[PDB]
Amino acid sequence: QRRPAGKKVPFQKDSFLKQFEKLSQSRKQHVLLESARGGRYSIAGLDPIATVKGKDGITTIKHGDEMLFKEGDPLRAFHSWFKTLETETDHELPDFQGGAIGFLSYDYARYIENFKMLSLDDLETPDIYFLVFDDIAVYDHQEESLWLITHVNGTDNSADVKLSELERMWLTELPAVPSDGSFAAPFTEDGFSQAVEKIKQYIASGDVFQVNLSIRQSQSLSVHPYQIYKTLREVNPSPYMAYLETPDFQIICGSPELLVSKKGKLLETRPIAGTRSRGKTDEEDESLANELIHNEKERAEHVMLVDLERNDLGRVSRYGSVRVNEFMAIEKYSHVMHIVSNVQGELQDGYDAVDIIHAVFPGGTITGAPKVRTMEIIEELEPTRRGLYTGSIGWFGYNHDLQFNIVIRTIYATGGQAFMQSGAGVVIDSVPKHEYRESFKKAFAMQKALELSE
Numbered sequence: 001q002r003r004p005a006g007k008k009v010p011f012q013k014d015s016f017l018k019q020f021e022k023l024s025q026s027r028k029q030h031v032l033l034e035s036a037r038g039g040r041y042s043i044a045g046l047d048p049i050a051t052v053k054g055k056d057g058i059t060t061i062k063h064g065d066e067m068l069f070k071e072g073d074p075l076r077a078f079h080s081w082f083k084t085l086e087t088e089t090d091h092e093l094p095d096f097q098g099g100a101i102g103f104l105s106y107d108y109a110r111y112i113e114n115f116k117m118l119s120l121d122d123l124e125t126p127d128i129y130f131l132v133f134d135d136i137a138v139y140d141h142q143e144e145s146l147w148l149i150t151h152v153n154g155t156d157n158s159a160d161v162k163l164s165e166l167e168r169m170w171l172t173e174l175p176a177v178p179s180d181g182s183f184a185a186p187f188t189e190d191g192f193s194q195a196v197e198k199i200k201q202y203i204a205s206g207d208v209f210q211v212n213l214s215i216r217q218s219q220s221l222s223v224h225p226y227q228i229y230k231t232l233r234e235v236n237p238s239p240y241m242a243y244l245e246t247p248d249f250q251i252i253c254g255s256p257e258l259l260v261s262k263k264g265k266l267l268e269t270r271p272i273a274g275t276r277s278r279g280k281t282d283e284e285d286e287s288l289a290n291e292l293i294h295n296e297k298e299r300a301e302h303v304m305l306v307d308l309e310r311n312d313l314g315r316v317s318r319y320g321s322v323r324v325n326e327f328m329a330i331e332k333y334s335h336v337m338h339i340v341s342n343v344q345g346e347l348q349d350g351y352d353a354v355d356i357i358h359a360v361f362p363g364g365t366i367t368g369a370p371k372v373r374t375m376e377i378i379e380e381l382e383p384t385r386r387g388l389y390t391g392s393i394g395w396f397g398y399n400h401d402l403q404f405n406i407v408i409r410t411i412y413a414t415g416g417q418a419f420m421q422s423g424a425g426v427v428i429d430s431v432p433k434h435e436y437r438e439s440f441k442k443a444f445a446m447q448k449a450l451e452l453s454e
């Protein structure tokens with residue numbers, strides 16, 4: 001009889017964000033998924049019922065005094081436990097009605113494809129990490145309402161008591177309250193350049209069409225990570241932002257990109273590929289958008305990545321159900337514009353959350369085409385494990401819905417350092433120095449956010 005029970009309250013976005021900051025201060029582990037520019041929902045998880053950590057074939061589920069552990073595919077280990085908490089969808093509640101919020105490391109891909117063990121794991125990022133929530137606050141930006149949601153079995157005055165405690169917590173103004181390690185070096189310029197030349201050799205030879213090659217920069221963290229998040233929200237607000245805090249690492253995510261969503265049977269992915277800086281004039285913007293959309297090399301790159309996503313979603317979709325409902329729109333983000341497409345499919349009966357992740361993860365747009373060969377080349381060339389970079393942050397619903405971003409425009413804070421990773425799409429005619437500089441430019445929002453925070 002397990003089901004979600006929710007209360008809808010009129011509420012202001014800024015009240016929600018301020019109350020989150022105040023409440024989260026007393027919580028060792030918490031997460032915010034924020035729609036800071038576009039998007040409908042912002043999701044606060046304060047008090048987890050469980051912590052799920054998977055690394056190198058071992059998964060731990062910490063739930064009160066109990067720590068459950070099992071070997072194998074960490075997501076399969078997670079799913080077999082998580083299935084016991086499954087619920088029916090309440091169509092009155094938001095898309096997220098309770099469940100797991102966290103991340104899949106890029107290195108979760110090692111359970112999907114056979115990877116060589118070449119790149120150095122110096123950050124020891126979990127392969128999966130989820131906070132599981134019966135109790136959540138979901139802000140609906142479209143209805144300007146706060147949903148407070150709990151879970152019960154059978155008993156319905158049980159629900160009302162818990163919802164009253166959540167109301168007390170969220171609708172009561174909170175008092176005025178007060179507020180090292182050694183890692184591998186970045187890819188050198190010479191190292192990156194020699195890797196660009198190696199990728200071009202593989203392209204010439206017909207192994208791949210395009211590879212995202214990335215560089216990991218780091219600075220000393222001199223301010224609280226949440227301050228960096230608040231700055232990034234100002235510098236570059238995005239529809240798939242996230243802040244996740246634990247004692248060992250914090251994540252400051254400014255992603256604009258959806259990897260995959262599932263609402264009932266409907267699967268969607270939203271590949272972004274092709275870019276220009278916004279104009280000064282908001283008419284310059286029309287002409288820059290017009291230039292981007294008439295640019296045959298950006299269109300070719302975009303169509304290639306849409307085909308790759310069609311094939312990925314096709315692996316778990318009813319035959320003939322995969323459609324591009326939105327093909328090659330320009331969408332203006334805070335400081336750039338992108339070519340963006342929307343790819344939909346109907347989930348074939350018998351495929352579950354793990355099957356969907358195995359089909360689409362990691363995203364085509366941050367590896368290359370074809371994906372499996374591209375990941376082999378990345379692993380051969382990049383000196384360090386990607387970890388969270390080009391992984392996915394999001395949620396698994398108890399009702400079997402899900403929603404994951406792609407981790408780009410993200411700072412990972414651990415061991416007194418802030419880590420910032422960005423890449424460039426290497427192609428047949430790439431100039432090593434151009435792609436090196438292009439990866440530093442992609443890191444601007446994040447180094448800027450850091451500098452402003454002091």
Ligand SMILES: N[C@@H](Cc1c[nH]c2ccccc12)C(=O)O
Binds near residue numbers: 404
């Ligand atoms: N933009 C999503 C919610 C969201 C915000 N940040 C996220 C990060 C990851 C996944 C989802 C999200 C929505 O409105 O539906």
